[PDB]
UniProtKB/Swiss-Prot annotation, chain B:
The active site is at A97, C139. Its EC number is 3.4.22.-. PANTHER family: CASPASE (PTHR10454), CASPASE-RELATED (PTHR10454:SF245). This is Caspase-1. Belongs to the peptidase C14A family. Involved in the activation cascade of caspases responsible for apoptosis execution. Inhibited by the baculovirus anti-apoptotic protein p35. Cleaves p35 and nuclear immunophilin FKBP46. GO terms for biological process: apoptotic process; positive regulation of neuron apoptotic process; proteolysis. The keyword Hydrolase applies. Residues 146-156 form a propeptide. The two subunits are derived from the precursor sequence by an autocatalytic mechanism. GO terms for molecular function: cysteine-type endopeptidase activity.
Length: 235, 260
């Protein structure tokens, strides 16, 4: 076909690995436990299988270990793969993520996937879905390092809205929106349209969101889609 | 099969026919009242070509040459305080030198989030719901390793690589920094990014969503990257591209209505 083709070549022997880093508990004094992070995780794991990814869930790893797996992923023959997915569910800001032991900078997640370091994923999409809740519009008191490198995609969250069953909580707006979308849609739409709609879903549940009666600030809080893709991505 | 009109809070597309399209305001810098900082020759190409197409898309374009930082902030704010209730959206272009998280005016540098600050819902209820687009070209482009001389650094640590993204519905940021240009003899003119941007906006800006569009802009940038400093053979893989940050909640198709 072309070097200037509208789509990503999505059909080699296998789809690619999705590897999910999932944090519920923290060996860090006074960081509250993340309950029903397992709903999101197991919901995501579910759908990514039906899309053809070889999924691996890693629950509660020490910061150093994540780097070992991520890296030991980055050093494989992805030649038979259509792409790569990495999901992280945890606590923190836009620019510091938590592991069971300590925080780290999000850039360490995509660091080892660049073409010079992962020549076998060259031109294949490399996708990173981070949900790292914390969300109060406040920086008064009187983000991450975006990789400029074709074919990365980063959807980052921090919207602290959830669904909760009884009194305990379980499964967040963001992660749910993204499964429903990837499920009841992922084979007729490009990824960026999809993720647009995920935003809308989050954006719309904001209105089940703390403020009211005319509280300073207004327009909904959504995920951040950062995209260096060069092609339309249709699963 | 078709295109339709109204019905949803959960409608797929932005309402893109109000009385007006909106305002595009371009900030263009070529010279710098700062020692060391080289002239951005041929930034005038980009500027005048952007401006051309946004008029055909039906914006009321305004262009501000080599302004001081205080003056940029004066007009940005003065823009945010307008009745956009008649407008479909809002565009800000900024073509200057600088990094991913510092931009230059004639006088001094400033942070990109000063550009979209004054425009959020609480501060611009008349743009609330409406798409606010910022395209920014801030040329400088080096991702290290390859040579091992003509430098300083030894021990690691390179944070603050990027800007502060508005976590806010309906903003969209398209940021270049890829320093490749077309050039005419010795002189330069027109960046790969902007010519790409304009070609897509012109010969397609009307039947495709803003995001697919910018996707194809990346492709075009990535592809010229190979007229790029090392990489001295073969096909390679891909490149260094624009950065498209999106908090959009609907597909955004540049719609129309002549007599409105």
């Amino acid at each position: 076909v072309d070097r200037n083709a509208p789509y990503y070549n999505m059909n080699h022997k296998h789809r690619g690995m999705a590897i999910i880093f999932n944090h519920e508990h923290f060996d860090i004094h006074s960081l509250k436990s993340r309950t029903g992070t397992n709903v999101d995780s197991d919901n995501l794991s579910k759908v990514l299988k039906t899309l053809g990814f070889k999924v691996t869930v890693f629950p509660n790893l020490k910061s150093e270990e994540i780097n070992k797996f991520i890296q030991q992923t980055a050093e494989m023959d992805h030649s038979d793969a259509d792409c790569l997915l990495v999901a992280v569910l945890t606590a923190g800001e836009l620019g510091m993520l938590y592991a069971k032991d300590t925080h780290y900078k999000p850039d360490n997640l995509w660091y080892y996937f660049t073409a010079d370091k992962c020549p076998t994923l060259a031109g294949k999409p490399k996708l990173f879905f981070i949900q790292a809740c914390q969300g109060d519009r406040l920086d008064g008191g009187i983000s991450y390092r975006i990789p400029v490198h074709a074919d990365f995609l980063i959807a980052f969250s921090t919207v602290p809205g959830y669904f909760s069953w009884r009194n305990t909580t379980r499964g967040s707006w963001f992660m749910q929106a993204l499964c429903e979308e990837l499920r009841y849609a992922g084979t007729e739409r490009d990824i960026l349209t999809l993720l647009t709609f995920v935003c809308q879903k989050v954006a719309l549940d904001f209105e089940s969101n703390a403020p009211d009666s005319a509280m300073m600030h207004q327009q909904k809080q959504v995920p951040c889609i950062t995209s260096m893709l060069t092609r339309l991505l249709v699963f």
